[PDB]
Write a protein that binds this ligand. Structure first.
Ligand SMILES: O=C(O)[C@H]1CNC[C@@H](O)[C@@H]1O
Ligand SMILES: O=C(O)[C@H]1CNC[C@@H](O)[C@@H]1O
Lengths: 655, 655, 335
């Protein structure tokens, strides 16, 4: 009677097609075959076909039901076979996809499921280029879905089949259109469709409709909902969601059901005053996050998403840009749950300072880009956290000019979802910046040359020249190795093998001050919350890594800048953090010590003797200058005021 | 006034897309990037995108002409850009392709030509699998073609635009339909089309037609030709060809012209008596040849084709199977010139003893297969040497079953060219063998197990059970290293690291005797004329090589079997060849010496002392038994009779 | 010169058999234009070097072909200075075998050149920069300044791919991916003329008879190869310079060889054809029509200038005099 969702992750037989003999090894999903070679900095890591095969017992009692194989993600092309007969293809590495196998299997026996995954280079599947790894394989879950022959359809771009369209939302009332896809393979007849909105045990809406479904029908039903005096999803202040059950009934029996969240809110972006959520100004304190991790590549487990979100909330993050592609359903779920305003985007990624192009002007590429956009929007439609749809990152006009195609994507986004604005992330001047509703730039003033001050100049000049633009900062950052430490502050070469941590700290303190004074900037996103994989990189403390994270690739170590942001953004958790603790060897005659704290002041101790109190500045920073160390070991301690104080401590050597 | 054909092979800038920085190196076409890694036996050799860029000066005086970039071959996908704007894509590694660039260039300046070549794995472009290397890149010539605005069209699958259809051919008369594609971009008006057939300075046909061509017209004209008492293209006996000039004229001025050969013949294949050319039985003494070579991979220069053909003619080859794909125009030209009956085929290649599949049942694969077949037939239509179109090699029915698709390809071949029969090369029993007009099998009785005798049993049983089949042998062979030698004859393990030359010799002598007695076998083709590259191989004297050649990979050394065939097939060139000369170390008490000769007998000398004469058998082999060597060095000499004899000699050591 | 190490007994046997005067050497090899050092000054290295020298001399003592023992190739004094150790090796060679002189192959000025009885230099004037003429200047100046030195040329050469061809003569970048065959031909003709006029040079050795393996190379028509051979790595193809030397050095075997046959595509308005022959003269034919005879010069070279080709295919033939002549032929395309 109930819909079943069966995980098919364990024990698949794997081999590369370049291994011609046919023998296989066991693997377990999520899986990528690029977790060792790409992460070792091998620039020509394996990009081609890997094959997964599993024997699936089709239970006799599933006869009469409908059966679907749903894939959460396979990078980048998947060809699926049942009993070695081809059933379909998916092109795109980040969107879910589904095939019905109801009439393709033999009931009561083992059937072969074969997936031939290809992450070889293509010129007709975005992303074509990018500063990250194109990890190959079935790197998200695989499900066997089992439903009634009359069901809420899972066949609409592999979405849940329900779109809760937020037409009008205010504190007085919300009008929602529940769009429901129905799929019928039963004999001609009827069913009753019910849409139930609840808050815990309390019933908020219950709307019903009798529907006549022809054999073979695949149709869209639209049920209007009205909620009086709604409780709004209000970011981290109150991430409230209703639950919606959508169900089908025949003769007073429920025969199918799906649940989706309903987090109601309204928003706008003001060119002069920034982002407003539910009628109130909201600074977007944002970071970016790639979907990979040390040692496992992009084969992330649920605890990895959970941990990433825990670290961001610890830091006081209230906004995120999930670059550079559609990410996991579970990850958008955590954004919903924790109230994090989210920018979600398609992988329409340009070259940046590197070679080749993000756009190749041929129908196959362009049609496939539209498919990946429709996938993004339909598959992730109901997540309240998503407040912006991103259409590109660092495209450029030279050669194949993407401006007209990006206009087509913008119009398609607005058609698919008029309830959210489009955005984009640019490193260019010119017409590419004037298509999406909001615009943002990737700025590295003070890292890739210049000084942080030119970010202030760029922001002010652009805002004055183009007062209609809603200006954001879609990336800003600096590299750091936790193993590169020096007593003095000196700007390093960005592309070199020396990325002292103190420069990243300096960079973020200076850039944050510029942002904090400019409320017309509707959101800013640190590049990046975590170090991440990019095989071609040859910089910092090891190849193959982009080290602009606030936290290391294995999520183990928070860099000093993490705590600068935590003090400023997470003000209600008491803390004190001494900066430059990893710089154990000191040689400067005049030592400077610096702490980040939520307290109004702090006290410094050197070798157990107080150096006195210093006040925190407006950026939660306390600084002591001309501190005198003695030759050899020195114990440095900082303490907040109060009867029960907080402390941080380190032993440094002075010579 | 004249059509120009300008080679664009020298000095291109190259880089891999996995090299992200943008710097390049000079390369010169023909080029493959897999001439070192695949040939070293690296099984995961580079399969992905390589980029070639060249500045092309567009001369001011070309304004008013039409300009085309014609590619003879790029493996396997090519995306072409002019001034970095995409102009088109080709999918398929072995057929020619063309783009007009007339209205895409700036006249009087340098224009960028960029080719982005991809040999990454695909499941929608045959060949999907195969016992050979998928060498990537622009491995054949690139041309700039310059024509009048009214021209014999080069735009019909990049063919010459002229199809000389051999409708009826006999010694009394030949009826030919000259099909001519015309392309017009001039203002509405007329031109005169002339088709001129000559034999040296003698005029055989001259047919003319006035044609009215609308602006933008792309049309087909058909001019009937009648040749009384023709001189026929008759294989190696008389490879005679007429020359055909096809020209366009305006106001008594020739404005365009193309030349094509006309080699007239008729043929049939008899299920009981074999192949008949021009009404006369012709044993097809065939070999196969791949288009690669030591050190250069498939980036063959003209002297490489010329040399390969010289070696085959030296051996008395009169038939060839140019496996496993469309090969170079120049190579089919040499077959025409030297009278070699040719099997040409599409790369519809199955796995053999290896994993995966030759057929993936999806529209993209199937449509692309049809395109590669149409390319093959239209591009190579006028070569008299081609007498069979091959549709597949070792497909199998399990999983995706290609039988119905192969029937579609057979019907398409017959539509495109009713003047040649279809054929195929099978390693299967069953329905796949009953589609093409002729059928052939790949047989390794005595190499991959069993004994040569079971080839005789298979041939006789099949012929008796299925008397309607025209049976051929599309492959037969055995491996040999010239560096593996042993005094005794012992069958080696096929997959092992020991391939003694004497077993390959034994294999071919025994298999040839079986074939020679069976005239119902219409043709047999040795696998292979030359050792060739197959990165995944781990056998013989080094990895990465299929060593079943009669001649080594560098074309330097002829193995003993080469001379067995030469004695039997090239009977009018006097020769004597002592076998087993490379086996320098002898230990058998009773030595056997063996020579291949065109003479009726030969004489053996050991240490300058005659051992007497022995008669050649029916297979041009002379054998001396129980020859007594003395400890240490022995000089062995064999001599033909006559006042001016031929000799072969070797020094062996006996111990 | 069987560089850069003791080679097979069977190879020295063939030198004995065929009468080839042989330089045999130990692998005491320096870096040349590359990094690191040929000499590391520690007892283990030095004692092992002496062992390899004693091995060379005792193992190959009886080969008449061996007339020189080579002690090093391109060592340099900077850092660990091998001069004193090379003197020790020289004294050891003379002790082990007073019946042969020592020699060495240098790319340096200074004291390293004054230890062995004969000395030789590796010279690439006209390949690694400069012009062949500076070889003549170096040889004459050294000989005048140091009249006691027995001066040889232990290496001279230029790279060539048989797949790199161009109608015009232009010096390529040595380290680049374009090594046109005609520059190697030019290089050897010019250097040979300089050597031939200087009998005080006791021996000269082409680097190299064959292309050979050097994994770190990234030049010519493929990586991993030193392409200065007169013959290709697989021993299949003789480059044009092979036949220049054959005409000059093997005078009693009649021959004619047309140069630049691999350069099939011609575009120069005025074509030059060049043949190497043992004959006193030869005749050129273009499309079956004689262009007349030309005399061979003192270096067995015959040259025809301002030859007129017609658009498209041209058949070029050269023939020696006599009732039974020798010929060489090629078809080129002119456009
Ligand atoms: O250079 C960087 O670190 C960033 C520049 N903007 C685009 C990012 O993908 C890239 O990682
Ligand atoms: O095993 C072999 O050597 C041959 C078997 N038949 C197919 C060929 O491609 C293959 O090379």
């Amino acid at each position: 009677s109930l819909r079943q969702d069966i995980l098919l992750n364990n024990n698949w037989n794997f081999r590369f097609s370049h291994q011609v003999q046919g023998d296989t090894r066991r693997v377990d999903l999520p899986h990528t075959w690029n977790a060792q070679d790409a992460l070792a900095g091998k620039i020509d890591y394996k990009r081609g076909i890997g094959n997964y095969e599993k024997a699936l017992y089709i239970r006799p009692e599933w006869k009469g039901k409908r059966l679907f194989l749903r894939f959460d993600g396979v990078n980048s092309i998947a060809d699926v076979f049942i009993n070695r007969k081809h059933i379909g293809e998916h092109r795109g590495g980040y969107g879910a996809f589904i095939f019905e196998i109801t009439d393709l299997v033999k009931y009561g026996e083992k059937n072969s499921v074969l997936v031939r995954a290809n992450n070889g280079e293509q010129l007709d599947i975005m992303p074509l280029v990018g500063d990250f790894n194109f990890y190959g394989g079935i790197y998200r879950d695989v499900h066997l879905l089992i439903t009634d022959e009359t069901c809420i359809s899972p066949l609409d771009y592999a979405s849940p089949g329900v779109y809760l369209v937020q037409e009008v939302v205010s504190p007085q009332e919300a009008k929602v259109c529940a769009k429901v896809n129905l799929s019928n393979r039963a004999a001609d007849g009827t069913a009753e469709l019910q849409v139930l909105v609840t808050d815990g045990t309390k019933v908020i809406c219950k709307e019903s409709r009798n529907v006549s479904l022809k054999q073979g029908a695949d149709i869209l039903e639209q049920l209007p909902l009205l909620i009086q005096k709604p409780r709004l999803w209000n970011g981290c202040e109150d991430p409230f969601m209703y639950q919606v059950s959508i169900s089908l009934h025949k003769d007073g029996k429920q025969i199918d059901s799906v649940t989706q969240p309903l987090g109601l809110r309204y928003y706008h972006t003001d060119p002069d005053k920034g982002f407003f959520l539910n009628g109130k100004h909201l600074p977007l304190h944002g970071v970016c996050r790639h979907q990979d991790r040390a040692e496992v590549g992009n084969a992330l487990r649920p605890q990895h998403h959970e941990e990433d979100v825990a670290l961001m909330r610890e830091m006081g993050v209230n906004a995120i840009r999930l670059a550079h592609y559609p990410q996991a359903t579970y990850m958008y779920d955590l954004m919903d749950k924790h109230g994090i305003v989210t920018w979600a985007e398609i992988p329409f990624v340009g070259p940046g300072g590197y070679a080749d192009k993000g756009f190749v002007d041929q129908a196959s590429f362009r049609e496939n880009g539209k498919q990946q956009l429709i996938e993004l929007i339909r598959q992730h439609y109901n997540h309240p956290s998503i407040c912006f749809w991103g259409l590109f990152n660092e495209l450029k006009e030279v050669g194949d000019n993407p401006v007209e195609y990006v206009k087509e994507l913008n119009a398609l986004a607005k058609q698919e979802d008029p309830t959210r604005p489009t955005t984009s992330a640019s490193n260019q001047d010119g017409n590419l910046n004037f298509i999406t509703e909001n615009i943002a730039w990737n700025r590295y003033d003070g890292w890739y040359g210049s000084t942080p001050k030119t970010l202030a100049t760029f922001l002010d000049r652009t805002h004055k020249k183009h007062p209609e633009l809603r200006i954001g900062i879609s990336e800003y950052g600096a590299g750091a190795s936790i193993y590169h430490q020096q007593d003095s502050l000196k700007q390093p070469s960005a592309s070199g093998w020396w990325h002292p941590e103190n420069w990243q700290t300096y960079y973020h303190m200076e850039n944050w001050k510029i942002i904090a004074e400019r409320p017309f900037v509707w959101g800013t996103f640190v590049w990046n919350m975590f170090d991440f994989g990019a095989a071609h990189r040859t910089e910092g403390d090891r190849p193959g890594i982009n080290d602009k994270g606030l936290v290391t690739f294995d999520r183990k170590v928070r860099k000093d800048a993490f705590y600068f942001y935590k003090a400023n953004w997470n003000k209600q958790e008491p803390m004190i953090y001494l900066a430059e603790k990893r710089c154990r060897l000191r040689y400067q005659p005049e030592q400077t010590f610096m702490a980040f704290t939520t307290a109004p002041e702090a006290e410094l101790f050197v070798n157990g003797v107080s150096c006195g109190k210093q006040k925190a500045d407006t950026y939660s920073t306390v600084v002591w200058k001309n501190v005198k160390l003695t030759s050899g070991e020195n114990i440095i301690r900082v303490t907040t005021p109060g009867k029960k104080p907080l402390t941080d401590e380190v032993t440094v050597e002075y010579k």
